Design an enzyme around this catalytic site. Sequence first.
Site, PDB file in Angstrom:
ATOM      1  N   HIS A 160       0.758  -4.519   3.274  1.00  0.00           N
ATOM      2  CA  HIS A 160      -0.607  -4.449   3.772  1.00  0.00           C
ATOM      3  C   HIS A 160      -1.230  -5.844   3.741  1.00  0.00           C
ATOM      4  CE1 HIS A 160      -4.200  -2.474   5.218  1.00  0.00           C
ATOM      5  NE2 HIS A 160      -3.813  -1.249   4.870  1.00  0.00           N
TER       6      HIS A 160
ATOM      7  N   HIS B  20       4.202   0.432   2.551  1.00  0.00           N
ATOM      8  CA  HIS B  20       4.357  -0.660   3.492  1.00  0.00           C
ATOM      9  C   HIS B  20       3.589  -1.891   3.022  1.00  0.00           C
ATOM     10  CE1 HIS B  20       0.376   0.224   5.427  1.00  0.00           C
ATOM     11  NE2 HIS B  20       0.695   1.520   5.428  1.00  0.00           N
TER      12      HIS B  20
ATOM     13  N   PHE C  45      -9.695  -4.410  14.164  1.00  0.00           N
ATOM     14  CA  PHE C  45     -10.165  -3.006  14.373  1.00  0.00           C
ATOM     15  C   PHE C  45     -10.242  -2.260  13.015  1.00  0.00           C
ATOM     16  CE2 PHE C  45      -9.593   0.477  17.937  1.00  0.00           C
ATOM     17  CZ  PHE C  45     -10.956   0.583  18.087  1.00  0.00           C
TER      18      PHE C  45
ATOM     19  N   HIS D  94      -9.266   1.970   9.424  1.00  0.00           N
ATOM     20  CA  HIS D  94      -8.773   1.084  10.483  1.00  0.00           C
ATOM     21  C   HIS D  94      -7.814   1.815  11.394  1.00  0.00           C
ATOM     22  CE1 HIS D  94      -4.745   0.576   8.550  1.00  0.00           C
ATOM     23  NE2 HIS D  94      -5.396   0.579   7.380  1.00  0.00           N
ATOM     24  N   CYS D  95      -7.629   1.254  12.591  1.00  0.00           N
ATOM     25  CA  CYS D  95      -6.546   1.684  13.455  1.00  0.00           C
ATOM     26  C   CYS D  95      -5.218   1.296  12.805  1.00  0.00           C
ATOM     27  CB  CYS D  95      -6.642   0.975  14.814  1.00  0.00           C
ATOM     28  SG  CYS D  95      -5.334   1.579  15.908  1.00  0.00           S
ATOM     29  N   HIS D  96      -4.240   2.228  12.814  1.00  0.00           N
ATOM     30  CA  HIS D  96      -2.947   1.963  12.199  1.00  0.00           C
ATOM     31  C   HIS D  96      -1.912   1.382  13.169  1.00  0.00           C
ATOM     32  CE1 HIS D  96      -0.026   2.045   8.927  1.00  0.00           C
ATOM     33  NE2 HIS D  96      -0.846   2.717   8.127  1.00  0.00           N
ATOM     34  N   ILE D  97      -2.317   0.981  14.376  1.00  0.00           N
ATOM     35  CA  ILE D  97      -1.502   0.049  15.192  1.00  0.00           C
ATOM     36  C   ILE D  97      -1.767  -1.328  14.564  1.00  0.00           C
ATOM     37  CG2 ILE D  97      -1.215  -0.967  17.462  1.00  0.00           C
ATOM     38  CD1 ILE D  97      -2.181   1.839  18.618  1.00  0.00           C
TER      39      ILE D  97
ATOM     40  N   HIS E   7      -5.586   5.339  19.809  1.00  0.00           N
ATOM     41  CA  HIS E   7      -5.646   4.651  18.528  1.00  0.00           C
ATOM     42  C   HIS E   7      -5.545   5.665  17.399  1.00  0.00           C
ATOM     43  CE1 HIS E   7      -6.881   1.000  20.554  1.00  0.00           C
ATOM     44  NE2 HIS E   7      -7.789   1.702  21.200  1.00  0.00           N
TER      45      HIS E   7
ATOM     46  N   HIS F 296       0.749   4.660   1.164  1.00  0.00           N
ATOM     47  CA  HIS F 296      -0.050   5.273   2.197  1.00  0.00           C
ATOM     48  C   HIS F 296      -0.287   6.746   1.986  1.00  0.00           C
ATOM     49  CE1 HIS F 296      -1.286   5.783   6.564  1.00  0.00           C
ATOM     50  NE2 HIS F 296      -1.155   7.005   6.088  1.00  0.00           N
TER      51      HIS F 296
ATOM     52  N   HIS G 296      -8.210   5.110   3.943  1.00  0.00           N
ATOM     53  CA  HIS G 296      -7.666   5.018   2.596  1.00  0.00           C
ATOM     54  C   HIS G 296      -8.465   5.891   1.623  1.00  0.00           C
ATOM     55  CE1 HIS G 296      -5.404   0.871   2.890  1.00  0.00           C
ATOM     56  NE2 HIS G 296      -5.553   1.320   4.130  1.00  0.00           N
TER      57      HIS G 296
ATOM     58  N   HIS H 273      -3.544  -4.102  16.164  1.00  0.00           N
ATOM     59  CA  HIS H 273      -4.985  -3.885  16.338  1.00  0.00           C
ATOM     60  C   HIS H 273      -5.777  -4.196  15.087  1.00  0.00           C
ATOM     61  CE1 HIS H 273      -4.104  -0.972  19.937  1.00  0.00           C
ATOM     62  NE2 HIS H 273      -3.633  -2.192  20.144  1.00  0.00           N
TER      63      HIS H 273
ATOM     64  N   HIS I  68       0.856  -1.228   0.000  1.00  0.00           N
ATOM     65  CA  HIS I  68       0.000   0.000   0.000  1.00  0.00           C
ATOM     66  C   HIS I  68       0.861   1.235   0.000  1.00  0.00           C
ATOM     67  CE1 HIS I  68      -3.190   2.789   1.217  1.00  0.00           C
ATOM     68  NE2 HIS I  68      -2.696   2.961   2.435  1.00  0.00           N
TER      69      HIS I  68
ATOM     70  N   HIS J  99      -6.978   5.658  10.447  1.00  0.00           N
ATOM     71  CA  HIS J  99      -6.551   6.038   9.087  1.00  0.00           C
ATOM     72  C   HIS J  99      -7.618   5.608   8.093  1.00  0.00           C
ATOM     73  CE1 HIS J  99      -4.259   6.375   5.378  1.00  0.00           C
ATOM     74  NE2 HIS J  99      -4.166   5.051   5.240  1.00  0.00           N
TER      75      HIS J  99
HETATM   76 CU   LIG Z   1      -5.533   0.723  17.913  1.00  0.00          CU
HETATM   77 CU   LIG Z   2      -0.870   2.849   6.082  1.00  0.00          CU
HETATM   78 CU   LIG Z   3      -3.456   4.068   3.783  1.00  0.00          CU
HETATM   79 CU   LIG Z   4      -4.196   0.763   5.576  1.00  0.00          CU
END
Ligand SMILES: [Cu+2]
Ligand SMILES: [Cu+2]
Ligand SMILES: [Cu+2]
Ligand SMILES: [Cu+2]
Length: 499
Positions: free
Chosen positions: A112, A110, A463, A452-455, A397, A67, A402, A458, A65, A400
């Site tokens: 995905h 990164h 999440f 989604h959460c980007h941790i 949290h 980002h 897309h 998670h 992905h 993010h």
């Molecule tokens: Cu999180």
């Molecule tokens: Cu990302």
């Molecule tokens: Cu993204």
């Molecule tokens: Cu993503």
Amino acid sequence: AQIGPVTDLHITNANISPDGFSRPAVLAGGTFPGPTIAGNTGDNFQITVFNDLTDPSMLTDTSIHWHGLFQKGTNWADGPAFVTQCPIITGQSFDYNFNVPGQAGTFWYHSHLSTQYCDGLRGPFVVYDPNDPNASLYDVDDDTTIITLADWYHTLAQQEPIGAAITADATLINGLGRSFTNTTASPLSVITVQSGKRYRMRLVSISCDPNYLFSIDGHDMTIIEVDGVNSQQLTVDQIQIFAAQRYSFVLNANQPVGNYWIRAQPNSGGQGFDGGINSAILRYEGATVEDPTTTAPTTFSNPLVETDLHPLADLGVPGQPFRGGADDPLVLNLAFANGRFSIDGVSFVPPTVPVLLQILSGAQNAQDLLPAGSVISLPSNSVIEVALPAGAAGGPHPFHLHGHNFAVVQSANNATPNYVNPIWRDTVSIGGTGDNVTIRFTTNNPGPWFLHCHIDWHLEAGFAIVFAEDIPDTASANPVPQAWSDLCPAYDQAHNIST
Ligand SMILES: [Cu+2]
Ligand SMILES: [Cu+2]
Ligand SMILES: [Cu+2]
Ligand SMILES: [Cu+2]
Ligand SMILES: *[C@@H]1O[C@H](CO)[C@@H](O[C@@H]2O[C@H](CO)[C@@H](O[C@@H]3O[C@H](CO)[C@@H](O)[C@H](O)[C@@H]3O)[C@H](O)[C@H]2NC(C)=O)[C@H](O)[C@H]1NC(C)=O
Ligand SMILES: *[C@@H]1O[C@H](CO)[C@@H](O[C@@H]2O[C@H](CO)[C@@H](O[C@@H]3O[C@H](CO)[C@@H](O)[C@H](O)[C@@H]3O)[C@H](O)[C@H]2NC(C)=O)[C@H](O)[C@H]1NC(C)=O
Ligand code: NA
């Protein structure tokens, strides 16, 4: 050297020792972080990704992905596994062929797939602006002015328990740093400046989890960009940067020639700077080659506060100036229990058929889409509001979206919304108990967009949800190449999956 906008990118396994401890990794371009992919605003990027992975302990499939890049008309190139594509299998390659109209700033790429980016597949992605409105504020902006912040683990990602509080073993700044336990005096990164020059430092969180308190002893930092969005100048002495966020700041090399600590304190893992953990070195040309002797203050007098940020351009806020003042006002119920996260009562588990392929095959409402309850349709050409009230365990949290950036109508730790001039960005901390961080955007980009959460731990624990934006126009807006159509047959054949 930077690569792109047209380049091959090989994904391999190799041993690395960025903190003195050797472990195998998943790497782009043979390094951690991966090479910087770069071009100019509006360029055509064609990144032909060669999957050369063979170690199953970090997964031999992959998907990448880009980002923060909107992918308008190219949803198939976005990268999230089982949302926009099936993974690329080993020994195969795939050309991510897209354009970056109307965007210029600091981004990253990164893996995905699962938690694979934690195992090393992460690097910077910079879209320069030949007519940058901020160009006169600095002298130098190049590969030497990118600063990456990363968490690094000695345990491989596929051995991290799902839903657990997972803690790193080192902070890496530009790929180097020292381990929190069994600390060895392994090499620290050096960022070199010339007395009197001004630098556009492009600060990139490539974290899988922690947020960092970032500062440079003796120096302050003038923010000019937030997640790709040009800002008014805001001078700070510390930046708390959450996973996946980016800032550009002007560094004025206006202190005496010398060595100064660069500090990145994570919210979990090792606290402080003993043995040179959580550290890198700012060196002026002409300084002695030795470690800094500088001190941090006990408290930082001008930390970044997100409500202080404002766009450089007159971006405003879509909709009406009150809660619920949008065509499609949503409130997500964000929860955690028993090792799994949920959104609106449903924990995300990736489907067998990618969401985009389900829609291209004719499924045309969100209740026809899998996973059931994990896909929300958005109407076209409409103002969307999404309230993200915090409280779920494991905060804060960083959420993010897309395909989009968004106005941050309400930020962490402040109950007052801003319908006039808040910053726009793509990843936002939702704060703490009782907060009501809220975002707005307009739907002008048909396709399924992950939220989604980007941790990353998670996301793996569920999440996430998918916004199926303008389902009726998804197929006409996003023509797909044959190589994309070939991905799911190849993946399912290789994995003995029926579909
Ligand atoms: Cu999180
Ligand atoms: Cu990302
Ligand atoms: Cu993204
Ligand atoms: Cu993503
Ligand atoms: C965050 O802000 C959102 C708005 O952006 C707040 O949403 C509001 O939530 C209340 C319930 O907490 C909603 O009122 C309830 O509606 C149901 C009917 O759908 C009714 O049966 C209940 O008796 C109550 O009226 C409201 O629709 C909703 N949206 C608004 C006001 O625009 C949310 O509460 C805020 N969260 C936090 C933690 O501050
Ligand atoms: C909590 O968040 C709110 C909303 O983002 C922040 O409120 C905003 O505070 C700014 C800065 O003081 C106000 O702007 C100022 O307006 C005055 C009057 O026009 C002007 O002379 C200054 O040039 C500046 O623009 C802004 O009106 C205000 N907005 C709202 C909706 O209240 C607040 O500062 C944040 N709290 C903390 C502690 O940072
Ligand atoms: Na407006």
